[PDB]
């Protein structure tokens with residue numbers, strides 16, 4: 001199973017200066033819940049910004065750099081390599097990977113961040129006429145989680 005994993009704002013901003021534009025602990029908990037025990041594929045810039053593999057899942061980095069060899073990370077050098085990855089595979093950014101994979105994934109787990117942030121990277125436009133809402137759940141807010149957000153699971157029609 002091949003799934004997109006992403007948080008984007010009302011204008012589909014996903015990043016600014018190689019980091020998330022928002023601070024939202026609950027969404028990171030959500031994404032770790034979805035992906036534990038599975039596989040995260042990420043482009044090189046996204047990986048470098050995280051800086052270290054996420055524990056308790058297979059971390060795969062897509063890069064053209066043949067000198068890339070990081071402890072606890074598997075490297076791939078083509079999109080085609082993604083299809084050889086066994087199990088539930090999550091496409092986890094950044095913009096380049098989303099653009100390359102959005103026409104290929106089975107479904108998408110999207111957190112809509114219900115705000116407008118300054119961004120330099122975007123999730124590609126998509127339409128609900130291609131995607132059925134399997135679920136839509138409003139995130140609960142508190143002191144440390146102050147931006148309204150909605151967890152979507154969309155499945156390709």
Ligand SMILES: NC(=O)c1ccc[n+]([C@@H]2O[C@H](COP(=O)([O-])OP(=O)(O)OC[C@H]3O[C@@H](n4cnc5c(N)ncnc54)[C@H](OP(=O)(O)O)[C@@H]3O)[C@@H](O)[C@H]2O)c1
Nearest residue numbers: 006007014015018019043044045046063064093094095096
């Ligand atoms: N909001 C979210 O849920 C979320 C999640 C993840 C990331 N992000 C954001 O996304 C932004 C980064 O996106 P980005 O597009 O700048 O970078 P990126 O997708 O993270 O990485 C781009 C790099 O990935 C490698 N790559 C991509 N396609 C390739 C291919 N077909 N063959 C070989 N290598 C390939 C290349 O690495 P090389 O140059 O080394 O060859 C390319 O330069 C950051 O701001 C980050 O915060 C947001």
